[PDB]
Symmetry: D2
Subunit: 315 residues, 4 copies
């Protein structure tokens, strides 16, 4: 029976706060029917699995368990949240080698299991580890996806939303580039219910230009703020990962900002970097190329350049 294929399975690799919250979000919203949790700390994963199971009588059913890489054989989706943090006194290049070593020992056993699905990558630095995952897995470009700037975009939209007092779902604005310090806002196409930010400021000159600059700076630094205040960040990214998962698993052809492979777009090549893209059950369908201003295009170039120098050096 063809309906035997109506069982969706996600293997989650990494059971820190992010992975754990992602699993909870998936449970609460009833996305996918099976979640296997893989982490070097086997006790912690057993612990989360059976704590999450208690939620199921209040939601839809799911098979949730502590898993092994071999459990990915028939998974639709492999979500990687396992990245080693940058220790003080390491260079970005060192963070990258330390994490490539680890990422290899995940991707290789996963591919060897027979996994033939989509890789969703959220471990930091995400655009680099997304490229790495593509390189190590041999999967097609469009079946390796990074969260990229989805979270920064959400932060940006919510920030604007609060300012103008509007549901953030009616606010459309992007952050693009490498997720991290070189990311940048796309003010030129940002809007609220179709009305652009430029047009909105003209109607509401109380809103000073410097406020908007601060708003973005605050967005770029939001992770640092959160870590200062409570030790780690996780609810945002978890939620974004769930959103992306839903878009793939329900074949939505949704537009989201994501780490995708550049094949000429923005004058870029052979890197993963964050931009709006159409995504569905088969991964990336289209990469939207926003026509940027000169300033904005420069920012994209600078972001891509530093990113690319680091990739080359790392291999």
């Amino acid at each position: 029976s063809i309906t035997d294929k109506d069982h969706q399975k996600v293997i989650l690799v990494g059971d820190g706060a992010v992975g754990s919250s992602y699993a909870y979000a998936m449970v609460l919203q009833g996305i996918a029917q099976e979640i296997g949790i893989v982490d070097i700390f086997k006790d912690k994963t057993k612990g989360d699995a059976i704590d999450l199971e208690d939620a199921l009588p209040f939601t839809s059913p799911k098979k949730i368990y502590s898993a092994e890489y071999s459990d990915a054989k028939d998974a639709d989706l492999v979500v990687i949240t396992a990245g080693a943090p940058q220790k003080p006194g390491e260079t970005r290049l060192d963070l990258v080698n330390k994490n490539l070593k680890i990422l290899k020992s995940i991707v290789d056993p996963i591919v060897d299991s027979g996994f033939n699905g989509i890789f969703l990558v959220a471990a930091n630095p995400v655009d680099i580890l997304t490229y790495a995952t593509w390189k190590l897995s041999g999967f097609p470009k469009n079946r390796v996806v990074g969260s990229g700037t989805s979270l920064d975009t959400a932060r940006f939209r919510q920030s604007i939303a609060k300012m103008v007092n509007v549901d953030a779902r009616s606010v459309h604005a992007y952050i693009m580039g490498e997720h991290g310090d070189t990311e940048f806002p796309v003010w030129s196409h940002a809007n609220i219910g179709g009305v652009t930010i430029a047009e909105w400021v003209k109607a509401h000159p109380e809103i000073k230009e410097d406020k908007l600059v601060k708003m973005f700076e605050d967005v770029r630094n939001k992770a640092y703020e959160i870590i200062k205040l409570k030790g780690a960040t996780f609810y945002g990214i978890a939620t974004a990962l769930a959103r992306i998962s839903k878009a793939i698993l329900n074949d939505e052809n949704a537009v989201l900002p994501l780490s995708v492979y550049m094949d000429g777009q923005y004058g870029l090549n052979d890197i993963y970097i964050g931009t709006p893209a159409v995504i569905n059950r088969n991964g990336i369908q289209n990469i939207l190329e926003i026509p940027l201003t000169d300033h904005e295009e420069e920012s994209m170039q600078k972001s891509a350049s530093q990113l690319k120098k680091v990739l080359t050096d790392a291999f």
Copy 2:
């Protein structure tokens, strides 16, 4: 890519009020990604398809269109709502032959398309047409499913719910048998939040026995009441069909009352009749056999007997 199979497709046959409402329910609740609508009135189906499309920007995406039987090749689910009504002066046997002729001209082109999914049958008389569909399709017993007494059960639960002033989801009571005049309530296992109806009446003797009898009679006659008042019934059954669809498509292993094949249960054989069953992506997994009282078992026997006599005669 294995995720290419994360696209769910339903072919709906019959675009009367029931089929049309079923399609709307599926759209509103975002169940399945594709709905093809098949009916002898091609204009009406085009009309519904494009009226339903207008709802999509407020819900999840779907491919919805006027379809042909050949469009079932890769469908997960074929839902049959096309039954000719009983004209005055026809016998039940005649209603059955008239509908077998029609049902043949549906099931044969569907099977010929390559359809390899699950048949969900709701056309009346449903337990007979479910058997017919099994016979004509050659599909396994457990991949041919009728709505059976799901709707009567819902009516029964809501009826009790109103009486005791409780959310109907906390009320658990079945109607079983052939959907129609010979169906019967399973008072012995009916309960509210675990407390049985017997126990509830003991605590609340204001509730007279005759009230409960009337409550069931009203349930059995509810279709007639609705038709008297507004011409046809459709919201209930549509909703039930959507529920069943969700259980299959999300592989729930849900318990629902459904038309299922009797292989000894209740002392019955070689008919489809309504009973609680476990259902998932592969159709019927288990048939629950409720231990009935003597009265209740008699009712089941009588219901099955008249039903079976009609089947035999019809072939």
Copy 3:
């Protein structure tokens, strides 16, 4: 205080639209009580008890055949009662309006009016006039449905989830409505920018797309007698935005107090809506061509009001 966490909608008009709206509300678990009011007291009883059968598969609701007096404590009164061009219905539908708004107000109703009967922008104005309610608590569906049609139309063409497509139809709902191509976009990329990247898409296709949208009701009626799923779904969306206090942006029939150079009419434009009705009216900066269209639509609308 939690005694106030019970939401109640009185639906007036139990045709296909109203009936479908009720079903949508049931399926998506919006509001806890629905009263259905119509001339045909048997038909409303019939729908009420058919809809009740869905409740064991959704959240609970009190659903019943209702009277205008049942609106005393309603949050929401939704008016769908029309006769079966949308302008050719104006006098027939004002007569029906008149008989509804007065008994509703007399009941003590102190909520929001949501109007969907055609011609909607006129009947919305009428409803404001007859009710004496504030401007911002009388809301028409306006061009929400046309906008949805427009988005879906674009979505199909470019093969993208309609929720990622942002484009408006504004003006009077009906023949003088117009598309706002200047601000239409897909995931932020404008239609102009999209066509440049995808020149397979010819300019005449886009014009046809809009014409088809403007005639869609007629096409549907030709094919199946009436239209209802779209508008029902839109009404449910608007109801949810009010009842969950969303501050959502939607195209709606709202009162013009200067916007676009317009005054003392209800006409369709993007607006922010929440539990207290209309908060803001968004004023899209239109092109000259687009502004002309808005003016013509408004002019012709104001003539008919008289």
Copy 4:
């Protein structure tokens, strides 16, 4: 009147439980405002703004670091603030309780208290005593979580959706709680009847199943330090039942006024709940063995209260 369609929850205690509860509420779009109150004012700011990042993917909410005074107009106050047996926490947690309920009541709060701090049935009673609120507007999570664990446990065993499995744990949440096997069932078929049909299922398995349920918190803490997803999800379920006026049946800490021969304690039993808190207390007819267990649980509980 629709000005009252804004639902507000004040959450007290921003540990893993409270934080997860907030997330659950966000993800499922329950309530429109969440204030978070905790000793650690930095941690609550941290969670508030981390949770805000989820809102563009869900419905809108006002989420912020709050003070007890922010409860003036809240619908719901949820108390999760505990020290890290569940009885060995009683004095430490009463001290914390004391410092919460008084400022909340003093703010003008006139809603429902939902209590989840351990030991829950004791702290629920305490909360009633300290607040002076009516019995039925002070609600403890009680054995909702144990019941969920029990259902899920059974569900896994018989390979069925837990929502089709109906079985309770009642009594004091903790060591003296007990299963109500007499009324436990799967799709109406009782556990007794199920075992008869499936004798592979041995009696000692069922006993182990319950023992494992009763020790599940300890198992989880052994494995990962704390438990939170289950209780958070249960609290969200209870919140939804109140805020959407469901009249849902759930096992909860409720005041005994004679039921089971018990008096003047809160203890866990099935109850009907809606916007006004507890409407009915269901009194399951227990077997002799089961009633004994309920009595022992209640006795031991009443001793500790003193």
